[PDB]
Structures are given as structure tokens and as C-alpha cells.
Design a protein around this ligand. Structure first.
Ligand code: F3S
Ligand code: F3S
Ligand SMILES: [Co+3]
Ligand SMILES: [Co+3]
Ligand SMILES: [Co+3]
Ligand SMILES: [Co+3]
Lengths: 66, 66
């Protein structure tokens, strides 16, 4: 499966990630992105998550595969 | 780009990873696997690293992308 993470230091609350993939990303109290789930198994959620990772203007998103 | 890592605690020195992807994995002095590279850009190397990750008997290998 997959695992998504957002570097809370890099993120600038652009929110383009939560826009493209609202099922995977959400805004926290610090006004930064944050993974919605701790695991992605569905191939479509993986597709928009990777779509978000590609869109983040500060490259705060990474995706791990196990 | 991709980044490979081996959990030093999980690894049991099966070495099937270095067998399949000898350009990515090597054995360290502690008898455990260790990525000999810090970044994979090439897709050929990416494939055998994903080949090894699925072959490792204790799931000590993970691949992250950015
Ligand atoms: S800046 Fe933060 S809010 Fe989303 S688009 Fe990049 S991870
Ligand atoms: S046990 Fe260690 S040596 Fe390779 S096959 Fe798994 S990472
Ligand atoms: Co909220
Ligand atoms: Co970019
Ligand atoms: Co040596
Ligand atoms: Co397995």
C-alpha cells in the first residue's frame, strides 16, 4: 500500500493538494496540509495523491510505498 | 525521483535484495542490507528496487518518491 506525508515545515498552506485530492488531504489548525488517511490502497486515491504531490508549489508532499 | 531505505531493525540479512538489485543494495558490516545509492532517477533501477521490495521476506524495504 501507500503512505502520504506533508512536511509541516515546507508547507505554506497553498491548499492545491486538498483541492485536487480532498479525500487524502485536509487543512489543520496550523493552516498547513495534513494527510487525511494513514494508508492508501485504492488506485484512484493514489492517483490524485500523486497528482497533488506533483502540484504542490513547495514540494512538501512525499509518498511512501511498502 | 525515488529514495530507497532499509529498516536496520527488520532486516535479517536474507540478501535477496542485493541479488535482484545489486546496483541499489549492498551488505554492510552489520550483516544487513543498505542502499548504496541515495536517489534513483533511472526507471530500470527503480524497477528492480521494487522487485526486491516485494521479495524481501521481512518487509524491511520501502521506497519513497517526491
Ligand atoms: S503548500 Fe501545503 S497545503 Fe498542500 S499544496 Fe503544498 S502541501
Ligand atoms: S532481509 Fe535485508 S538483506 Fe535484503 S532481502 Fe530483506 S532487505
Ligand atoms: Co478540520
Ligand atoms: Co514541483
Ligand atoms: Co562492503
Ligand atoms: Co512481502
Amino acid at each position: 500500500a501507500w503512505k502520504v506525508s506533508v512536511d509541516q515545515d515546507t508547507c505554506i498552506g497553498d491548499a492545491i493538494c486538498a483541492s485536487l485530492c480532498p479525500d487524502v488531504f485536509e487543512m489543520n489548525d496550523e493552516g498547513k496540509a495534513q494527510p487525511k488517511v494513514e494508508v492508501i490502497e485504492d488506485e484512484e486515491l493514489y492517483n490524485c495523491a500523486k497528482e497533488a504531490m506533483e502540484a504542490c508549489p513547495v514540494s512538501a508532499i512525499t509518498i511512501e510505498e511498502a
